[PDB]
Amino acid sequence: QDVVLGLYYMTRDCVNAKGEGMVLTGPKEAERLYRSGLASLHARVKVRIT
Amino acid sequence: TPEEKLLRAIFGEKASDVKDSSLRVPNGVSGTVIDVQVFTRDGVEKDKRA
Amino acid sequence: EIKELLKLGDLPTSGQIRLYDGRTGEQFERPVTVGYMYMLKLNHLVDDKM
Amino acid sequence: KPLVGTGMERAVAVDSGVTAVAKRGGVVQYVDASRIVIKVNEDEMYPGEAGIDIYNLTKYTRSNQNTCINQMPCVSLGEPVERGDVLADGPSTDLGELAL
Amino acid sequence: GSVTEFLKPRLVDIEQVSSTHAKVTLEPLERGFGHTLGNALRRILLSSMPGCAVTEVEIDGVLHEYSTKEGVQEDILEILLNLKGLAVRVQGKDEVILTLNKSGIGPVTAADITHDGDVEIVKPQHVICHLTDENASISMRIKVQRGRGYVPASTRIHSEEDERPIGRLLVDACYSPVERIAYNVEAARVEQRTDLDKLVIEMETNGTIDPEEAIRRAATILAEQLEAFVDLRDVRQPEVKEEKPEFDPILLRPVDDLELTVRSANCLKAEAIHYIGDLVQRTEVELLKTPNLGKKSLTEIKDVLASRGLSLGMRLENWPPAS
Amino acid sequence: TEFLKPRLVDIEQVSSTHAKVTLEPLERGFGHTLGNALRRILLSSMPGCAVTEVEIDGVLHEYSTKEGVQEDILEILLNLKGLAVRVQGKDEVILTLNKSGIGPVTAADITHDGDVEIVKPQHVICHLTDENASISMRIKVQRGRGYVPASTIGRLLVDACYSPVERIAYNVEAARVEQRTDLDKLVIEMETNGTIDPEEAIRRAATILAEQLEAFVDLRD
Amino acid sequence: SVITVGPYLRLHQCGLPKKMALELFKPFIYGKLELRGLATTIKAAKKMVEREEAVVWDILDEVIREHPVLLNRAPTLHRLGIQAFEPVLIEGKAIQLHPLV
């Protein structure tokens, strides 16, 4: 229960709302999430997947 | 046992023909005594504390 | 009438309220529910059950 | 006292002997953690055989489940009280109103 | 060293709304910092703060904390709970014993305490008792200490006062003097730049401590703790304790363990004999030349020493190793 | 009377960039407070130089395409975000990149400046397909603070990485002190680039945090 | 003992109470004590742990190191009713468990 709602909340693509497709490379995005500005359930957005 | 007989002989016998069966507070719990009570047998030397 | 009681003393007529982490101090994404629930400590409990 | 209640718990406490309800309503003469004495006042008995009504109220005793069952005075001295209201409270209750 | 820009924070108007509530605004602040320090300070204040709190109370005619007293509407536990919220502020001590005598009909507050020259009582209007009959009289020696962070009586099982009388009642201790701590960032109208904030720190205390020595002691703890974040030598512990007692461990215990008379105990305490490691190596020649130690006292020693297996006045020139 | 100091300190560098640091002796919440503090310091309040503006010839807007290049303008700017720059003593420096032919367009193809030091010279930025392909651009490097996004003719904006720290995580983990019981031991995991080592990086953050609050210290006793 | 969730645990670990684990590995603590030193003899160890003497707890941290303790719940329907974990000392009187199993 607890963890799964957790990972479901980590997906669930929400349109715009501090979204926009500002692209980067994985781990750097983590700095983006903590440092606000961008939301988390947006937007969609593109990044480099290795 | 012989070894024990030697042992008390080295540290003082005092081998009383008595045992031990005192009421002790069980390991773990802890609190404060709020009331003691003594019901003496009808025909028994009542105690000082009693 | 519960909403009606949410006024008078001034309170968010939704039960919802935005909370802050405390560790990070950062706000939680969604407004959580905050109120007063009459709880009671049952018997059973530890110490005994161990 | 419990916030969200039912109004019923004021009955539970006083219906149970756990709480000391005034036998005859009058005026409190002496309050104490040890006891409470009330002076009948408004209409005593048929004989003029003294007013007063003494309530000893038990304190800090053990329960069948080893829980502390003790009574506490919720009424102050020199306060008027009628017949059938809480003078001394009990364990897990709040002046007439039950609190678990 | 020559890098970075950065700014500095500084105290502005400390609006004292009341004796408890307080507001300490910090204006010279940037954007990131004003939100970071908010949590650091909030935690250290809602925890790592000093203050004072009652620890012990000895009441006349009251053994345990479950009894009552004639003329007292409230029972002993309740009076122990009321003394929990004593807003005390001691000058320059670590331990004080405020006496509290009061007789006659009427409520006994923090005022009926003996007004000491060092103790500063915030609210003398504070409830503690409620005597009923005019012939009722009480007197309690209260003890107040200085510390930090909860720590009840349940922590000190018996690690204080080897004897500690029947009448001494242990009370829990709510040390920290900060009830609630909040803060809002807010954009600061600093007549200078444009993009700066002013960390407003809404505060609620008990009045036993001022917002000055409070925020300074707080930030000071953060600084001292950040002090280790500088260099990183990664200092390890040597450990390796020695596992080989050269002598019987019993020689380490004090003469109190001998369980002897008071006269003999005072003598050993006067001849500079603390541990049994000195009594075990002291002859009867030196025991006779001891003030107030006759035949009865000397017989007591040899009987309380021999029974433990030890003798009197042996020799062991190995006293003491070896820390 | 006061407080205690963290004594047992361990540091294992899972390379030059990735490392883990653990400090065991810490009181309640301090591990987390110092955690959030140092995390919030390392993720923005850290210096470091990164690409902020890019002016490519033939490319004026970001939604354009380049000829002879396997990677479009967006992918190119993205690779430029991964350019670790260490400038000697300037708050701004302009760089020029001119290169033609086939293969990987590395950072070694950038004009070797005296003041500017490129940490990773093999950092692949682009891919040229045919021999007749060529690219020339002006990459403006600035001295900033934190993470600058797109929120800030021929001037292509790129998200500025005014930070040498890629990611920061931290754990609580109860410490088993042989005297107390309610103590925590902070485990800080840092993932950085090449501009600065985790060793001096964390010390820098602690010092930056030290500049603030210090005005409220005083000594004497 | 009553179980409680322990998020900070791993998948091969469980929260085993101090006083609980002390009395449980009594025969192991004794042996290791007389083994190292500390206790002059076997009866010395008993009096040494009966008087929980600081140093004893560290030796306890030693004996439960890689000594698996297997857990069990009341209604054991299948094989996964009893599963083994690595003992983790926790200041408490309750037994903590991994929220996955």
Curated annotation (Swiss-Prot), chain B:
- Oligomeric state and partners? The RNAP catalytic core consists of 2 alpha, 1 beta, 1 beta' and 1 omega subunit. When a sigma factor is associated with the core the holoenzyme is formed, which can initiate transcription. The rRNA transcription and antitermination complex (rrnTAC) consists of RNAP, NusA, NusB, NusE (rpsJ), NusG, SubB, ribosomal protein S4, DNA and precursor rRNA; S4 is more flexible than other subunits. In pull-down experiments interacts with CedA. (Microbial infection) Interacts (via flap domain) with Escherichia phage lambda antitermination protein Q; this interaction renders bacterial RNAP resistant to transcription pausing and allows it to read through termination signals.
Membrane-spanning intervals of the chain = none
Biotechnological relevance of this protein: Co-administration of salinamide and rifampicin or salinamide and myxopyronin suppresses the emergence of resistance to both antibiotics.
The UniProt PTM text for this protein says: Acetylated on several lysine residues in the presence of glucose.
Q: What does the protein in this record do?
A: DNA-dependent RNA polymerase (RNAP) catalyzes the transcription of DNA into RNA using the four ribonucleoside triphosphates as substrates.
Encoded by which gene?
rpoB
Its family remark reads: Belongs to the RNA polymerase beta chain family.
Full protein name: DNA-directed RNA polymerase subunit beta
Portion held of the full protein: 896 to 945 of 1342
From Swiss-Prot, chain D:
| Industrial and biotechnological uses noted in the record | Co-administration of salinamide and rifampicin or salinamide and myxopyronin suppresses the emergence of resistance to both antibiotics.
Modification after translation: Acetylated on several lysine residues in the presence of glucose.
Which family is this sequence assigned to? Belongs to the RNA polymerase beta chain family.
Role played: DNA-dependent RNA polymerase (RNAP) catalyzes the transcription of DNA into RNA using the four ribonucleoside triphosphates as substrates.
Give the record's subunit note. The RNAP catalytic core consists of 2 alpha, 1 beta, 1 beta' and 1 omega subunit. When a sigma factor is associated with the core the holoenzyme is formed, which can initiate transcription. The rRNA transcription and antitermination complex (rrnTAC) consists of RNAP, NusA, NusB, NusE (rpsJ), NusG, SubB, ribosomal protein S4, DNA and precursor rRNA; S4 is more flexible than other subunits. In pull-down experiments interacts with CedA.
State the protein's name: DNA-directed RNA polymerase subunit beta
Q: Which residues of the full protein are shown?
A: 697 to 796 of 1342
Curated annotation (Swiss-Prot), chain E:
Q: Which GO terms describe its biological process?
A: bacterial-type flagellum assembly; bacterial-type flagellum-dependent cell motility; cell motility; cellular response to cell envelope stress; DNA-templated transcription initiation; intracellular iron ion homeostasis; nitrate assimilation; regulation of DNA-templated transcription elongation
> Which residues does UniProt assign to the signal peptide?
none
Pfam families tied to this protein: RNA_pol_A_bac, RNA_pol_A_CTD, RNA_pol_L
Q: Which GO terms describe its molecular function?
A: DNA binding; DNA-directed RNA polymerase activity; protein dimerization activity
Where are the annotated segments for Required for interaction with Crp at class II promoters? 160-163
Q: Where is this region: Alpha C-terminal domain (alpha-CTD)?
A: 247-323
How this protein is processed and modified after translation, per its record?
Acetylated on Lys-295 and Lys-296 in the presence of glucose. PatZ controls acetylation of Lys-296 but not of Lys-295. (Microbial infection) ADP-ribosylated on both alpha subunits by the phage T4 protein ModA. ADP-ribosylated on only one of the alpha subunits by the phage T4 protein Alt.
The written remark on domains in the entry is: The N-terminal domain is essential for RNAP assembly and basal transcription, whereas the C-terminal domain is involved in interaction with transcriptional regulators (such as CRP) and with upstream promoter elements.
What is the recorded name of this protein? DNA-directed RNA polymerase subunit alpha
Upper taxonomic lineage = Bacteria, Pseudomonadati, Pseudomonadota, Gammaproteobacteria, Enterobacterales
Swiss-Prot record, chain G:
Query: How is the protein altered post-translationally, as described in the entry?
Result: Acetylated on several lysine residues in the presence of glucose.
List its uses: Co-administration of salinamide and rifampicin or salinamide and myxopyronin suppresses the emergence of resistance to both antibiotics.
Where would you find the membrane-spanning parts of this chain? none
Instruction: Report the function annotation for this chain.
Output: DNA-dependent RNA polymerase (RNAP) catalyzes the transcription of DNA into RNA using the four ribonucleoside triphosphates as substrates.
Q: How does it assemble?
A: The RNAP catalytic core consists of 2 alpha, 1 beta, 1 beta' and 1 omega subunit. When a sigma factor is associated with the core the holoenzyme is formed, which can initiate transcription. The rRNA transcription and antitermination complex (rrnTAC) consists of RNAP, NusA, NusB, NusE (rpsJ), NusG, SubB, ribosomal protein S4, DNA and precursor rRNA; S4 is more flexible than other subunits.
Q: Family membership, please give it.
A: Belongs to the RNA polymerase beta' chain family.
| Protein name from the UniProt record | DNA-directed RNA polymerase subunit beta'
Q: Which organism is it from?
A: Escherichia coli (strain K12)
Lineage of the organism:
Bacteria, Pseudomonadati, Pseudomonadota, Gammaproteobacteria, Enterobacterales
Provide the gene name from the record.
Answer: rpoC
Q: Which residues of the full-length protein are shown here?
A: 353 to 453 of 1407
